[PDB]
């Protein structure tokens with residue numbers, strides 16, 4: 001069972017950035033497709049920037065957990 | 075802004091494809107004085123060595139009869155004079171001022187032998203040396219630096235401002251300006267790119283011919299004006315020299 005647990009954890013930590021980049025991207029794309037005015041766009045630019053920062057945070061977390069999971073003593 | 079300077083040299087500049095570079099500094103930034111409109115606190119400060127100036131100051135004060143000023147200035151200036159960096163007057167400018175305002179050849183030669191050729195006098199030095207106000211000396215230095223504004227001045231470095239709002243507005247700009255078929259139009263390809271490219275190519279190929287053909291008249295006018303000024307001044311001078319000896323008639327009588 002430990003092998004299954006480990007592979008689950010590894011795959012989750014590996015796909016975390018892909019999710020942050022793809023599904024939240026689809027949400028942003030829905031919003032872009034639906035919005036027309038200028039005030040809402042001005043306010044949504046900051047959401048896009050926050051998504052940038054969140055993607056970088058997820059990438060850092062994944063890097064940390066992956067260097068923990070792929071570190072061998074011998 | 076007015077064009078300050080006492081020079082009659084008609085000067086134009088040609089540009090390169092490289093930007094001006096200055097030595098790295100973590101606290102200062104170089105900029106144009108007229109474009110920045112800086113203040114005394116925006117100017118950057120530094121420490122200058124006193125002794126070479128304090129010796130001449132002691133001499134001048136012993137000559138004029140005011141030693142309290144020297145003592146006060148020396149006690150203020152010890153451990154170096156902290157002053158704005160790009161607010162100064164050159165030795166040549168100062169000597170010209172002295173000569174045209176009537177300081178004796180002895181004093182001028184003292185200045186020359188005392189200070190190097192590349193020395194730079196600042197407004198506190200000028201004030202303590204001529205018994206003037208630092209405000210007036212600062213204004214004079216600023217005018218003399220604006221007369222030569224090709225030289226950049228060193229200000230305190232400040233981080234950019236309003237980056238978040240600027241990002242929002244630039245996003246709005248692109249969102250409203252690129253959601254169109256303007257850069258792919260038949261009008262674009264038929265008029266905007268051809269006319270613009272032809273103008274650019276002609277300007278790049280005849281860049282200098284155009285400038286010369288335009289500046290010919292101004293150069294001729296400036297030459298004419300200078301020649302007239304010179305000839306008139308010379309004639310008046312020589313005539314007054316002729317008539318200079320018309321005062322001894324009285325003391326002869």
Ligand SMILES: CCCCCCCCCCCCCCCCCC(=O)OC[C@H](COP(=O)([O-])OCC(O)COP(=O)([O-])OC[C@@H](COC(=O)CCCCCCCCCCCCCCCCC)OC(=O)CCCCCCCCCCCCCCCCC)OC(=O)CCCCCCCCCCCCCCCCC
Nearest residue numbers: 039040042043044045046047235236237238239240241242
């Ligand atoms: C008729 C029908 C239509 C009617 C509806 C109209 C709708 C209008 C909506 C209101 C918004 C108007 C547009 C302006 C937006 C603000 C732009 C801006 O200033 O940003 C630049 C701002 C300044 O930064 P900078 O320009 O880079 O550098 C300058 C420094 O920051 C230095 O900056 P500073 O010193 O000048 O100020 C700093 C300030 C900057 O913080 C801000 O962003 C300001 C936001 C204030 C919004 C107030 C809206 C008022 C109108 C609505 C009324 C709501 C009731 C509340 C009333 C206020 C009292 C609490 O705060 C801080 O940075 C942190 C310190 C906090 C200090 C205390 C601040 C609060 C002061 C007390 C309130 C003052 C009220 C004034 C009276 C108004 C009378 C009309 O930086 C930001 O961008 C902040 C983030 C942007 C905000 C959005 C964040 C993402 C959330 C998006 C929303 C969700 C998406 C939309 C979906 C919504 C679905 C429901």
Ligand SMILES: CCCCCCCCCCCCCCCCCC(=O)OC[C@H](COP(=O)([O-])OCC[N+](C)(C)C)OC(=O)CCCCCCCCCCCCCCCCC
Nearest residue numbers: 017018021055056058059060061062063064066067068070
């Ligand atoms: C032990 C090992 C640990 C490994 C850890 C791995 C975790 C991090 C993995 C994330 C990889 C993500 C990279 C692929 C996504 C970008 C694809 C792309 O290049 O688009 C074409 C980009 C953008 O092109 P574009 O948007 O201008 O137009 C064309 C785009 N296409 C072709 C897609 C239509 O090409 C570029 O010109 C990019 C040049 C700028 C540099 C961009 C790279 C920085 C941004 C990504 C950083 C991610 C790594 C962060 C690591 C942080 C670690 C602390």
